[PDB]
Symmetry: D5
Subunit: 197 residues, 10 copies
């Protein structure tokens, strides 16, 4: 969990990234205070699972946008290496044009802060972080190096967390838009448990 604890302000940071239009702007998590943010880390540039999951995100970038949610990727590689990677063709193992910002963390501080730094390699694991509109860490997901994440599950989550923040109800197990939620009140909750069995 590093220094990022769920329920608390997510570790801040200011890094150089590759915007969805080429060119290098200095992005800060803080610049998004007001929008949800799916900040995810991936191992190394020019590897395998990575391009598959980072492309999967850029492509669906719109779906997240319709949720006032800004996705943001990051690795320990330099921005120059990031650019070179996006220019590389997909069929060739590259990312190709991106609709998502890609952050570089060559100090590995952003990594240490989020506790996803595989020290023995100076690499970061497949950590994903869902921090909300106010800056509070709401979900954290880490996978070992051989297994990619699921944009769908991560979408489900954001919607989920966005619901609760505005309805004072809680999302039962495996909730999805339309599913039954429940009132977190000893009495009021029985209106949910009752219609179960």
């Amino acid at each position: 969990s590093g220094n990022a604890k769920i329920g608390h302000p997510a570790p801040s940071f200011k890094a150089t990234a590759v915007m969805p239009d080429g060119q290098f702007k200095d992005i800060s998590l803080s610049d998004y205070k007001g929008k949800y943010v799916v900040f995810f880390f991936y191992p190394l540039d020019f590897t395998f699972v990575s391009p598959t999951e980072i492309i999967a995100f850029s492509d669906r970038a719109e779906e997240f946008k319709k949720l006032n949610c800004q996705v943001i990727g990051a690795s320990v590689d330099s921005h120059f290496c990031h650019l070179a990677w996006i220019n590389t063709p997909k069929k060739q193992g590259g990312l190709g044009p991106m609709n998502i910002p890609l952050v570089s963390d060559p100090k590995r501080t952003i990594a240490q802060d989020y506790g996803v730094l595989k020290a023995d390699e100076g690499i970061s694991f497949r950590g994903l972080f869902i921090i909300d509109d106010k800056g509070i860490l709401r979900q954290i997901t880490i996978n070992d190096l051989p297994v990619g994440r699921s944009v769908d599950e991560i979408l489900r989550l954001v919607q989920a967390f966005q619901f609760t923040d505005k309805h004072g109800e809680v999302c039962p197990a495996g909730w999805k838009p339309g599913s039954d939620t429940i009132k977190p009140d000893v009495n009021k909750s029985k209106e949910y448990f009752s219609k179960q069995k």
Copy 2:
């Protein structure tokens, strides 16, 4: 995450537990050595979101068993409390009969070892952990209190890691049984991008 580090042995533990046939028993992580384990904490017994997750896991227990994987719940609550809750009918917010064991971590030391303890409440967060038959932790998943987790996603994840553990290939984003995988070699990986891109 506290002490649990993906890629290393999952912190061990010895704790009292209410087995599926009712009745207590001292359980140890090691006991389950040789098969996958999905260890998951939930804040408190008699709550609202928790009951849904725990029950979802119980019922889907066979699915996990087929996957040669043991599901184990966990909470700071005492076994006496656990039992009492399982003994409460579902329509009253109770668990009902269980197919899974519910460990009890009253010294809050286990939650500690899994960096899932919400110190300001002596209660754990909605953290999940999947460790493999060799004892190494392969994936940490943590949710803020309001949003329940997804059994399907965990199943996907277990299947994933298993696939990679026995095949020597890696799993692309969103991978599921049937999907294409990518040979983690610089060259032999083109056979994947050459089409799956």
Copy 3:
């Protein structure tokens, strides 16, 4: 025991509690300045000796009210577990309606502060503390698990104390209202010593 010392103010604390009217409320020791307080811990909820000790106190609650004294009980169990227990009938091992508020000490801090923490189990022994309307500890009592306490001996004590408070005349051994008291002076004490044998 712990930070609780006979003579000095009683370790402060603020915890959630289940109010007599079956309602959650954050209570503080301090909110009782001006009244004597009998603060007692009990191992766990849904146990055996314990339910006898608190119904004892809950039933004979008026007897303390007469003596302007609040009886507050507490264990490390969640206020959800607490309510659940009070909702379990007595013939089934429950508590049934209470006239005494029950407190949840999940972070174990209150038990640690009063020295009644049974480390190796994250449980509290059966410690009872009687505190005067000024807030300073007057009498402390701890029983090992198997042996429940005596609601009469507390009654006796809470009375003997309020007596010394208003008379500056000490209570001899086995004292009870009506019993002869002895004057704390070298001479005015024989008025008690000669009148015995």
Copy 4:
């Protein structure tokens, strides 16, 4: 309480004491292993509440021997001061012939180990420790100066404990020889709850 923790070996001690027959003699708490012990402190000699306590314990010392229970009393006063006090007629604030032994804790180390020391004046409060035949502390009772203790209650305790020892069964609230006990098992306990109320 000090180094005195219930469930653990009661703080050892070796002091000079004034035997029942007069005659001084260094005795050690270990000397009484194999027998239950009622070790109690009293503020000072030639005081008030105190003698009412040590004679009461001395006279009913019979009932304790009938329980293979040794009673020992102590104060920071020297042994020469204890003899002089047993040799001072009751009717004059004195003790008179003693059945139980009184130990002198001049260096105050014993009061410290049991944490009954009232530092602000080199005196010990009214603390009582009922320790058993194995040497483990089973009950701690401590009183503020103005209020003497109850030999009946301590009797009840020394009785209740020995009961639980030999019966692996537990004594409810207010238990006294004859009254129903309860058994520490979710099912068997019902036998107790099923009745009462």
Copy 5:
């Protein structure tokens, strides 16, 4: 010696004492400012050598008042014990009426302050401290437990110092009033050595 240094101000103290008249009165060493003071300690109350000493001073008291000198004795025994001792026919070791005050040092602190505390026994030694009107310790005497002190010799000392305090001269070996003295000047000294041996 603990804190008592010759030539420096004697360690201050404020203890409860049994006054010559009979009542208990807090007394501070400073209270006797302006007067000389012979302060002495004795092991215990109800001992042997001790009372003989205490009695020697309580009587010769006048001789001391003559020398504008206050006398005070002390032990670690309580004041209650102190009184009980004076209220004991001197025929059987009591002290009987006292013209001197008996100081109670239960905290063992003032003793510690003079460095006459026999820690291994929590009892003081036969320490004698002569501190003058200006409040500064002028002489220290300490005897093992067996042998008492000498009111005579102490009287010679008090006498001696006072002399030098006024005449700016020094008293040679075993000097009693009326004996030659010597002017502390290389030259003026001759007036003594010449008239001597």
Copy 6:
């Protein structure tokens, strides 16, 4: 004071001294085991109250030899300074021949051990010690600088100590050879308190 504690062996020492026969030797406390010793310091050589005090001893040397007691003097002055003082006419303020050994402590270590070292002046106070044949410190006497000490008094003591040593009785206050002693026993002591007045 210092390390020299009453009850334990006197701190050892090996210094250079001027023997009663002229010429120097290296003495050690130890060289005197089996015989009582009276070790006394004195401020400076060629002073006043000092020679009066020291000559007093060399003279009565015998009365001490008779008690199998060796007397030894010490100051921070070199041994050459000692030898020059003895060769200075008594009338001139010298010592003249001596029958007592005088040791030098030019490193103040012996004075520091006995805690008679007036640091601010690098001079030793008027401290005297009496150590038994077994070598343990029995009495310690220290006077400020302007007042000598009585040989007659430190003679009585040595006799008082040798007595208690071989008789099993204790020398009351003011004891002197031939005076009433008393047996330290609650009973066998009354043979003394009774025959008082």
Copy 7:
């Protein structure tokens, strides 16, 4: 400079490199014990001054080889990066085929060891070290980011060092093969200075 000190063994290291024949190999600096080594660091990959420096070395490699001198390049970038770079057309800013191993140092330990890490960027400066066939560092050269080094100069140094390692003489300023060298003696030195200056 870091842990690199001319005169002592150059800091040992083992990292994954990309060999000339393409292909990854874990190289260790000891692997070349026996031949001179010109180890050099360069900022990042896909930069400017850097690739002009690296291909300049790959192209002139044979010159070093004739000198039994292994050359090795290094940067913080991953090996997958170093590979994607060599597989980039020189005109495209790439490196093209390479004739020297390019080590990866993602943990910045190697940089830190040679003290060429630019902390504020986690990028290495343009540092080059030339260590001999015994493993000891003989020369260190470092340039601020914006100015590339000069292969000619390196060549000259390697020759000059090798020259001295074999001719027991020393190379003067500006020296190139076939230039006047000098005897490190006070006399044969004149052989240079004289017929010269």
Copy 8:
């Protein structure tokens, strides 16, 4: 190395130097802001590679002045040891007149600050630091004792840096005045790369 880091203000210093014009003078690196400074250390006065190195800089000095660059030499040798040497004809090994100041560092503090001190001998290595007009160090060159340096290379470097300084373009390897340079921009850098092999 030491306290000198390229990118930061070059360690400061002030020491006694022999001006090119003979006669002492306390020089300070700060006296040179506004202009580049090539600062070089050398082992010892009256050595071999040294004279050739310093005499070499002394001569080409005009080429540096041309470049608005001050050159300064330094050794642990005194100012006197220095002068004597300069006042020695080259044919004998001396330096002969100079056009460069020679700093003296008997304290060895300037060397430690530059990390060029050879502790085992209290002599420095052949370290040369070229620092710019703003005080910030730009290049560090250190050779082992046996091998002299190239005044040519320095020259190229001082030139190279001055260039990058004034032009905002980067100098490829080997770069000399006239040589091609690249625009440090992803795109604009291409107009140089396409012009290559």
Copy 9:
């Protein structure tokens, strides 16, 4: 050297000396500010080499006066000792009248300061220090115990140091008044060296 640093303010001190005109006086080194000072130490009083050294300075004091130089003797011996020793016939190993102050350092603090205390003895080595008219120490001379210093050499030194302070010229080896001195200039020094052999 202790704190005695050549070229630094000689260590200050205030001690009780024995003035020439008989009698005692608290003297300080700052008292002699304005004149040169030859502060010499000597082991012990009443010894051998010492008096021969001190009466040598006493005897030739006028010569040091003619240079505005105060000579001061020092020893750890008390001022009383000093006086007795000066008041002892030379033929008897005494000093006889003294025209020089003899300071007393019974606290060894002054000796520790001039680092000449022979700690393992309490005595001091034959150390002499000559400090100038500004308080700065200009020469330290200390001999082992059996070899005495020579007043002549000390006179030569004072003359030389004073000379230098006046003519800003250094005195060659062995210099005496009238001897050829040298100008501390590289050039103007040839006036000395060239006029040599």
Copy 10:
């Protein structure tokens, strides 16, 4: 001063020196255990007092040779500076043919050990140390820079010590060969003091 202490072994050292026969060699104070040794420091080569001092010792070298004493010079200057200055003719300010070795102390650690280092300047005061054939320091002489030492005296001192070590007598002030001495015994010395006055 430093680690050099009169009466203890002289701080050992090993340094390269320039033997009288020219051309280097590494000597160690140790290479002399058997011959007296006069070791002297001088601030700098090519200065002023210094030369006059060392050519002074070098000339009278035979003086000590016949006293089995070995003179040794030293300074921070390199052996190279040493030599250059040696070959420098006296009339130019140089030394010329030496008959004494001149160790070199570039580490400035030998001066440190001899507490003759002048830190602030990196030089060493004019300190001279005469150690005996057994390695123990006997005399330390240190002058401030401007004033040279005196061979004559040093010669006198070596002679003195040799005499004391050889005859068991001590040398009064200004002692020279032939001068009489005192037999270091109280009475025996008397045959010296009488021959005076």
